[PDB]
């Protein structure tokens, strides 16, 4: 027998590479720089079809993937790139004299009516302006003998760039594609935990459209599991691992800001403006989110039973979040421009003992759990990104209506030989929002040069 | 010869089959090693990372006398310690994907025993022309 | 073959001539496909676009066994519905530039009929060497 | 004509030897013309400059019918005014590094006498196949 | 190099060379003004009398 | 100051129109229509090929 070489051999090695972006065609009908996807990403097509393979069995793993870290770095650098031409503020670090924002013969509890001296476009001249600021954006100035003088929450650590009103925060889906010489393996097992062997593997060029949704303590508008609720963790024994629950059926949440704000432009310096809140044209109402109570109770009982699969003798308790700063202990998301921070202590308050209770014979089929939300504008969003951003206000009431498809739980510390082993919501590292979407995919390098013995002699 | 190509099974459809069935379809994996589009500086390297790899596979087969994308058999003796297996229990049941797991420990020195001089039988051929 | 090269006619001087006269001069159009200089990030693309387009033409001729920049004749049968023309009324009066207008609609399915069976004759030549 | 490859002598170890000794070890200088790593925009050019050069040497040897990294003997008549030297006083004592100092003035017009007609002997092979 | 018997269609009003040259001259002219002084303290009030 | 902030043109750079030759990359060619009566739209019966305009 003699050695004989072959070119074109399907042999794989998992390796690191630079995957690139693909977006759907209709976003290219819009103008440039509206979303980062339509500006430079390649036009995708359904021609690279999903192709099921033979008898291949391939190992997959989530918790040490490189696609999630690369996507996190891309989203950080791309959101940093989108804030470069926008106004950097900087003459808004003046002293703000904030009186009560008595909106038509009655005070508001969230907003202060702050007046400040702006330098105009003529730099030796100044004019007095006013704006209504949310109280999370406003810190009292010092220990001096004046309780009516305030400050922005910045200027102590950084200077915030106002987000441009012509760019949008809409999550256009992103397809991650491997370069030539590489392939993307997709695990098609419906009962797939996320770690271990997959016995139904396909090869794709460009991944399915991942929504870059930024959200804590819940997962919004994500993909749905095929047949059952899938509970993923790196190791369920360790308490410090975020338990990602993936729901088979979504729960519709509807969120709103009812009070009729307006937008007021203040010209700061030469040819650039600062957009702030003017009057509230109407009456003062509570910004809130609504979840159906029966469906959420049913979803929590189902999360109870596939949590009881791993804890066989114990009941399942849900407790409220651990507390701290409002950016950590609240469901933080973006309801079409305005950053909501909703209180979740009404959702995660209950227990499941082992017996399923049907949703029939309800007190009312239209009962709803209502969460009360605060709204921010100065967003300390990330790190190494140009770490803050002022979100300009949007006029009118706002509503958004989305689907909950996942949960990010966390088990409490082990004590008292506890019968319940309670769980709390968690968030703060954003990779877990995109790790729950890149669970099927892996990237492999093709090594097409192979060696085999045969009877051929040259 | 015949000037014709490939099969319709797609890029990796022969994975999981036999070594005989994946001795077919070899044109398809070879054809899909080059493409081109634009997403800036992150994607420009993803252009050249194709070419920098692909010409490497055109180096070794250009050296071994193969000079293409094909079956290329040699006259270098197969050391029996590499596989210790006959032809029928390799070619009719095993997959290339799992054959590589056994052979890739030794592929460096098999490439290493495909070393010293193809050049001397570019000289002996010249000795068939210049001298004979 | 002979060890010689191009012609002196320049890059596209055979355009407008016959298919016989443009069956000459073929080396010059294949020789001017690579160059290199620098005008920054706008021109760096114009470097790599020289290579990504060149090696693709080195793919297909490597697929079809031609393996070079030359006249390469096959034995895939010509379907008469593609041209419905004899040899002398193609090669002695027509230009390649206007022949491509007639053949370009069917060139994709001609390449599709150039996508079946090269790998099996490489296996057949392996059978001729090994079994015979 | 054999499966084997390059020798262990290193990248330029045959420099300073004879023309016959540097007729060996050609495979090593042929092997080390491609590599790749990253130091940004200064080094990214040092990636593509490895390709723009290398394919140029894959152009001319593809033009002349050589089509590889090997000895390629042609049948263009050597004009005696180029060297005015016999074979034994060229091959047994001289080095390539000092032979290039004598031939490099004339390599362009050697390419100017490797200039005119490879395509018509490809046509001669096509006439030997088709007409004969 | 003059060619043979070729007849070729040409058109100005939808060429891509002119739009690319316009974009190049825009971007190059923008690039040439980056290291220069941006003024900005000249937005003061100017008291302008007659330049007798 | 009502719309933008002007940057002063540097006194060491010049506004002189140095001629620019536009060249196609390798694998492309530039066709030049040599008809003297050419309107600008339509067929040209005297065409040459050039690398740099
Ligand atoms: C556009 O507007 C400009 C202002 O916005 C205007 O500039 C002003 O022009 C007026 C009118 O000429 C000047 O007012 C006169 O100044 C003279 C002073 O002359 C004596 O001093 C100078 C040096 O100047 C110093 O003094 C002045 C005034 O105190 C100071 O402002 C200045 O900063 C200096 O400290 C000196 O060189 C003179 O000597 C020369 O002239 C004598 C003959 O006169 C020669 O023999 C000698 O060899 C030498 O060449 C002279 O001794 C004063 O006497 C007048 O009473 C009057 O006050 C303003 O100074 C000037 N201001 C500035 C800032 O320039 C522009 O002219 C106007 N342009 C146009 C085109 O409209
Ligand atoms: C937040 O806080 C800001 C201040 O920091 C509040 O703005 C002030 O609100 C008060 C209360 O309404 C205003 O004071 C009142 O102005 C009456 C004037 O009405 C007549 O003039 C109108 C045009 O306004 C001119 O006149 C005022 C007063 O001289 C000037 O200050 C303006 O700049 C204008 O030149 C006409 O359109 C109208 O038809 C009337 O004829 C006056 O009659 C009252 O006695 C009282 O002084 C005050 O003008 C506001 N200042 C500014 C700069 O807007 C704001 O309401 C607070 N908002 C909330 C939600 O709390
Ligand atoms: C809201 O309350 C204020 C304060 O009482 C009202 O404004 C003043 O009312 C007092 C007596 O109530 C009068 O002396 C003043 O003349 C009023 N000033 C003004 C500017 O109205 C005010 O009317 C109440 N209602 C609204 C809609 O603001
Ligand atoms: C602003 O408020 C009005 C009324 O408060 C909203 O109008 C309602 O919109 C909902 C949308 O689901 C409809 O079901 C109702 O029939 C509408 N009318 C009323 C009287 O409630 C309006 O949608 C709000 N604006 C935005 C942008 O959401």
Residue numbers in the entry:
A (entry chain F): 34 to 139, 150 to 185, 185a, 185b, 186 to 309, 312 to 321, 321c, 322 to 354, ...
B (entry chain G), C (entry chain L), D (entry chain B): 512 to 547, 569 to 664
E (entry chain K): 84 to 135
F (entry chain K): 196 to 248
From the paper:
The HIV-1 Env is a trimer of gp120-gp41 heterodimers that are heavily shielded from the host immune systems by N-linked glycosylation and further protected from neutralization by conformational masking and considerable sequence variability. A glycosylated region near the base of the third variable loop (V3) of HIV-1 Env forms a supersite of vulnerability that is targeted by antibodies originating from diverse germline genes in multiple HIV-1 infected individuals. Here, we determine structures of antibodies in complex with HIV-1 Envelope for all observed members and ancestral states of the broadly neutralizing HIV-1 V3-glycan targeting DH270 antibody clonal B cell lineage. Here we used cryo-EM to visualize the interactions of a complete inferred DH270 clonal tree with the co-evolving virus Env.
Well-resolved density was also observed for the V1 loop N137-glycan, which contacted the I2 heavy chain S84R mutation site. This V1 loop orientation was similar to the UCA-bound trimer structure with a kink in the loop introduced to accommodate R57. Similar mutations occur in the I2 intermediate, most notably an F101C mutation spatially adjacent to the LCDR3 base that results in the formation of an additional disulfide bond in the antibody between residues 91 and 101. These included the VL Y93F, A94G, and S97A that work in concert with VH G110Y to cause a rearrangement in the LCDR3 region, creating a pocket in which the N301 GlcNac-1 N-acetyl moiety rests. An important impact of the improbable HCDR3 G110Y mutation in creating this pocket is the shifting of the F93 rotamer via steric occlusion.
